[PDB]
């Protein structure tokens, strides 16, 4: 079955294969030759498909993976949550993409998404991940990452095709440190958990806003960017309230309340983790 798929034979012309196992809610890639965790950028942590299939058996893994590199011709298009229970496409944007990008297509391991593998290059003005309102999403990659390989061919599309992908711009959002201070607040116990029922969410907002004022140097714009990636973000944040929004009033009250400020001369703080 899987060894008879033309796309698999094309991919098997590369020693960029891994195996993966499901751990928690994510799929971890493994070196198929020693069973250790595999880096997506170390070529000697991978194997050819013979080694990957033997390691899949040897270590009891859940499936094969393939690591994309800038040098190989492959592009990975991931259609998240686009299939119904009968493995039929339920998102109109996804139905359109498949009409316009015809190449190797397989059902993803969870059974409700699709993988499309194309020979080409991505447009430079599209974002790696686009999320839609119905919970579906579009992810595109051509390097620095592995894809799971299921061999569950969709609509008989078993062959990788050479295709220009500029028209991916119809579907992906167009594009034109914060993560540092995030990581800083996280490792110092200052990053909030998602609210549980019974919590005064608005009070969680202010406590986190105060911590943001310190760690962000009262940079209101940074504070806002940072809050939107936190488990306390909700639609109320952008709610018009009096002269502005609930979020903007919260952040300004935080800036007025906190006295101390973290300056990267490594200073420390009023609020405890």
Per CB under 5 A, residues contacting Mg ion are 68, 72, 74, 78, 80, 108, 113, 142
Find out whether 71 is annotated in a ligand binding site.
no
Token couple for 77: 């298009």
Token couple for 8: 């698999």
* Distance of alpha carbon 59 from alpha carbon 31, whole angstroms: 10
Q: At closest approach, how far in Å is the CB of 69 from Mg ion?
A: 6
Q: What end-to-end distance do the CA atoms of the chain give, in Å?
A: 54
Q: At closest approach, how far in Å is the CB of 254 from Mg ion?
A: 39
Nearer to Mg ion, 61 or 68 (CB): 68
Give me the phi and psi of 100, to 5 degrees please.
-100, -25
145 burial (CB, 10 Å; 0-12 / 13-18 / 19+) is middle
Find out whether 115 is annotated in a ligand binding site.
yes
* Distance of alpha carbon 251 from alpha carbon 213, whole angstroms: 8
* Distance of alpha carbon 273 from alpha carbon 271, whole angstroms: 7
Q: At closest approach, how far in Å is the CB of 116 from Mg ion?
A: 10
Residues with a catalytic annotation lie at: 78, 80, 115, 139
Residue reference for tokens 């020979």:
119
* Distance of alpha carbon 70 from alpha carbon 136, whole angstroms: 27
Q: At closest approach, how far in Å is the CB of 212 from Mg ion?
A: 34
* Distance of alpha carbon 162 from alpha carbon 120, whole angstroms: 6
Find out whether 224 is annotated in a ligand binding site.
no
Find out whether 81 is annotated in a ligand binding site.
no
Residue nearest to Mg ion (CB): 113
Nearer to Mg ion, 16 or 250 (CB): 16
Token couple for 194: 């998602």
Nearer to Mg ion, 77 or 258 (CB): 77
Q: At closest approach, how far in Å is the CB of 68 from Mg ion?
A: 5
Token couple for 269: 């703080």
Nearer to Mg ion, 150 or 207 (CB): 150
Nearer to Mg ion, 33 or 108 (CB): 108
Tell which phi-psi region holds residue 154, choosing left (phi > 0), alpha (psi between -120 and 50) or beta: beta
Annotated binding site for Mg(2+): 78, 80, 108, 115
Annotated binding site: 78, 80, 108, 115
């Amino acid at each position: 079955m899987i060894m008879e798929i033309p796309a698999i034979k094309a991919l098997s012309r590369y020693a960029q294969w891994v195996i993966w196992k499901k751990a928690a809610d994510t799929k971890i890639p493994y070196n198929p030759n020693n069973g250790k965790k595999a880096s997506s950028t170390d070529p000697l942590a991978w194997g050819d498909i013979d080694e990957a299939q033997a390691g899949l058996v040897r270590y009891g893994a859940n499936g094969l993976g393939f690591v994309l590199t800038k040098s190989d011709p492959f592009v990975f298009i991931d259609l998240d949550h686009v299939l119904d229970e009968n493995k039929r496409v339920k998102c109109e944007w996804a139905r359109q993409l498949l009409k316009e990008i015809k190449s190797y297509t397989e059902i993803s391991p969870s059974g409700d998404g699709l993988h499309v593998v194309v020979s080409g290059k991505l447009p430079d003005y599209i974002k790696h991940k686009t999320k839609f309102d119905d919970g579906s999403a579009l992810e595109v990659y051509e390097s620095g990452r592995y894809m799971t390989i299921t061999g569950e061919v969709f609509d008989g599309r078993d062959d990788i095709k050479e295709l220009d992908l500029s028209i991916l711009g119809e579907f992906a959002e167009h594009k034109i440190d914060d993560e540092a201070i995030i990581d800083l607040m996280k490792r110092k116990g200052q990053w909030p958990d998602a609210p549980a029922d019974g919590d005064d969410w608005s009070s969680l907002d202010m406590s986190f806003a105060n911590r943001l004022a310190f760690w962000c140097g009262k940079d209101i714009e940074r504070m806002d960017r940072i809050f939107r990636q936190s488990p306390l973000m909700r639609q109320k944040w952008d709610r018009p309230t009096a002269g502005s929004t609930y979020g903007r009033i919260t952040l300004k009250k935080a800036c007025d309340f906190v006295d101390s400020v973290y300056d990267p001369a490594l200073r420390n703080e009023s609020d405890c983790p």
